[PDB]
Subunit: 312 residues, 4 copies
């Protein structure tokens, strides 16, 4: 069906944005008014300490305002702020935006139009951002891994400008896992998805953040690394056993060859035991991985429609 | 008691079966009409992309149809589709069938008749399928393991044609474990079970699927592999300690014997420590295995009847 | 307070006891009638296959019977049968008995009288059973461990004849852990406990059962074995580092001493790394143990009475 | 806002305090009466065996008493007693005090006044207690770690005299984790916190308690130790591989150098494998740590206020 969008909800986490709030609000309001549909704006203050909350309250209390302000008691994180925002939306299309104006609000109409064609998730890709070699390689690896796992590609995973339909948000609200990534979670349930190119501000994370993010993504996406240990251990054990047998055969055939042959055979046995240790660790990982999946308990399926035979 | 069957429910997962749907529906309807009992057919579309959903809807909307069509929003897996089907059945006997017509629908009456004799689970075994040596050995090993664990044998675990009674499905719906195998889960609760031989289409998984399936079955059935590590480590440690003591005794008795005796004693100590490492890993596995069982939280018991003394 | 007992409930698991059921029922009924209090008897059939269920039903339907019969759909275990029995009791004192008549039913009045003095849990100890050396040593070790952990001693943990008050059973019904031991669980919540000596039939487990039972008890009682790994690793690492430093100091002081000194230093470094490995395994165990305790989620406390100040 | 306090609740765990109860009650009552606000006192008996319960009941039943007595069926721990006390409070400011009179009750007015300035958590620091070197170093390390993790410093973590506002207690009641530390849990949710200096009685834990407390704090605060294993393993593997390559290059360039060069190369390979083992253990820890966090399931966020646009 061609179920169209009739209301748009915008979610913007706020944390120490005193300088950028006025222009952000003005541009977002103008962009939303250009849609021709009903709309609302949600501002979530993640425990700011620079008078942002007062500005948000003033904006909410202004005449003819479409802004809903949500105040958290302290800082909890951008992911938690976004999840809190999702719990108070009312429209059928949800859009996430950055409060630093790094992504222009003027792109919202394009996302709305694309979603009106029948897509559940609409993403964005930043053009010619000129990242460093390591960051570009990491982006390529992450895109390939996500495409292989979820079946949907993602050119830019760190981009904040994205659109979701209401059922996607409803299902994502059912996942209580503390460590995750919202764009991956959306694609885990999306049927139809696409991405479009966008531009960005030319000028505006540390390495320690990058390493932790890589670990989080790998743990959220797959458990194969636990499986690779058994393969490595089996290879090592087979090599060690083959060398041990070959040493005895060679000594029995051509007699003694070196003064330290016994040491070499003992080293081969040691390598075999070391490989067995890797096999054991992989065996433990097999259970640990399933424990984790059962613990975080994502939904198994969703039913779209049920057709019963006519009663007559 | 001889509680007989009065309604039969058929569950068939569908995923890109546009070509086989008409003949499948016709033959299944004919077979069900030959029963003489009330019946219904459930078709679950697992996110097909070849117009199967439209055919299913058309079949459901046709006059005098006994077909219930269930549509999923996207692909989730055959196990999830079967579980969704179980949530919408209404009969007291449940039959699972394959949509590729590899197993003929004409065998259903035999399963119904066998179940009418008082069996809770009725299975099937394919005759003279002529599998490869490795697959046959794996089948034998799996059958032996399942027989030892659940107390019920299974000649063919990969066969899809099986019948279950309503209480079995109800109890299986209480298990939320993500990784499992439905036939094993049924036997875990079944009191009386049997299998019968069937024929199959002569002509129509990859090795990577086989290895993962073996791991899944082993993890679902038992935790002994975690126990074997302690035995291995104890054997290694005892051997190493015995060799270390023997070396000292021999040197003290008959004096020096080799130039590298100290190296040999150090290797023996190293082997003892390596065995201790296996013991430690087994110790960790002891807790991990119980954590997993507590996490997946299968039902502990089911009460069939309670008899109170007469009030008078 | 001297809250006395006014009704006694007897729980007896049944599994293939066709021969012993009549005498068991007769003697238990006589013993219960000698109490002078209200009483009931619960018989749980754990999937017997020797006509025990029919005998139990006949006994329940007999005139002036105090027997409640509970039938399970199949075999699940003695622990599960006892837990099912606890879910249907109605008295304020609960007694567990063995259906093989190994423990005479005539001891019940002594347990009732002892419980009437104000004890929550009353146990029994078998006299001069003349067990083997290993079994006696295991019993002593288990008794010491339980006394140290729960604060209550248990001379015989394998004895089935025991008495519990209703609140103890109610709290034990709140623990859903699959692997546990009921007598230990009772003492975990009991305030006042005691044991008394009893006699037993002279004549009537395998080693594999004993080893598994030891592992279950150790895992249910404590997590210290995970802590011992770090101590062992630290000792090994300190020894290795000390030897490595001593070798260098000795060589620098008195010059070269042996041809294989470098090999010895390398072995010392290897031992240090091996100790570090034990430290790491202990570090993992630290988290695993707490995960297990949080998973099995036993109750934290129970409130006996609350006194508010007089409203006036 | 300047929401002031209007009722004060005092929580005091009791365990064998027969001697100190009268003076404690008298001084606490005098201090509370000096506040000028409504107040109540909660006494929790943690299974005492020295007639403390009778004294508490007598105090509760005395005329014009503000004391609520809570009796536990047996001993469960100070943390459990405090949690039980929190479940029965009614005021908007909660104060915890020690029953041994080590911390004078006369400091309560200072805490109330400080909390009236708008603080959520108010702590205390003991001056010139003259602890040993190891204990002082441990205190410094714990303070630094807590400051880095929660963002709030704590000069003395072992001090019992502290004040909390009602929402903090309400959120802490939502955390069911068995192993934790209440002051850290409070700061995890507090927005504004402070500490003040206090005095203490000059004269009145064992080393085994200190080690367990350190492990508990480390496990409750962070998971970095699981991350350090991968770094250590990578360093070891890189060093071993570099040495192995250097040995071959040197031998090919300048020819043979030592009789035991092959042994050295084998040792280098062994070190590389040992480092790989550390990497694998860190890989397992990555999943274990996230499993633990998902298991103990702390609240993700709290909403303070929501402002909707004016309906007109």
């Amino acid at each position: 069906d061609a179920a169209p969008i009739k209301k748009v909800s915008v979610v913007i986490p706020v944390y120490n944005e005193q300088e950028s709030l006025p222009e952000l609000i003005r541009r977002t309001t103008t962009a939303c008014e250009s849609l021709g549909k009903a709309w609302e704006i949600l501002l979530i203050d993640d425990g700011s300490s620079d008078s942002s909350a007062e500005l948000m309250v003033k904006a909410s209390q202004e005449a003819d305002s479409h802004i809903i302000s949500i105040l958290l008691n302290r800082n909890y994180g951008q992911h938690a702020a976004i999840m809190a925002g999702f719990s108070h939306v009312s429209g059928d299309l949800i859009i996430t935006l950055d409060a630093d104006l790094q992504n222009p609000p003027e792109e919202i109409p394009r996302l709305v139009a694309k979603a009106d064609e029948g897509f559940d998730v609409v993403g964005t890709v930043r053009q010619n951002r000129q990242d460093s070699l390591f960051r570009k390689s990491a982006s390529k690896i992450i895109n390939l891994l996500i495409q292989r796992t979820t079946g949907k590609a993602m050119g830019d995973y760190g981009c904040m400008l994205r659109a979701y339909r209401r059922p996607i948000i409803d299902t994502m609200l059912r996942c209580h896992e503390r460590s995750t990534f919202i764009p991956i979670l959306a694609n885990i349930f999306a049927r139809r998805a696409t991405e479009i190119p966008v531009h960005h501000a030319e000028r505006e994370y540390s390495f320690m953040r990058l390493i932790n993010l890589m670990y989080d993504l790998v743990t959220c996406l797959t458990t194969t690394p636990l499986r690779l240990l058994s393969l490595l251990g089996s290879v090592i054990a087979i090599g060690g056993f083959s060398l041990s047998v070959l040493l005895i055969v060679l000594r029995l055939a051509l007699g003694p060859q070196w003064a330290a042959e016994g040491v070499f055979m003992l080293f081969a046995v040691l390598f075999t035991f070391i490989g067995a240790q890797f096999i054991g660790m992989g065996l433990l990982g097999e259970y640990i991985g399933r424990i984790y999946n059962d613990v975080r308990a994502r939904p198994r399926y969703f039913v779209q429609q049920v057709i019963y035979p006519e009663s007559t």
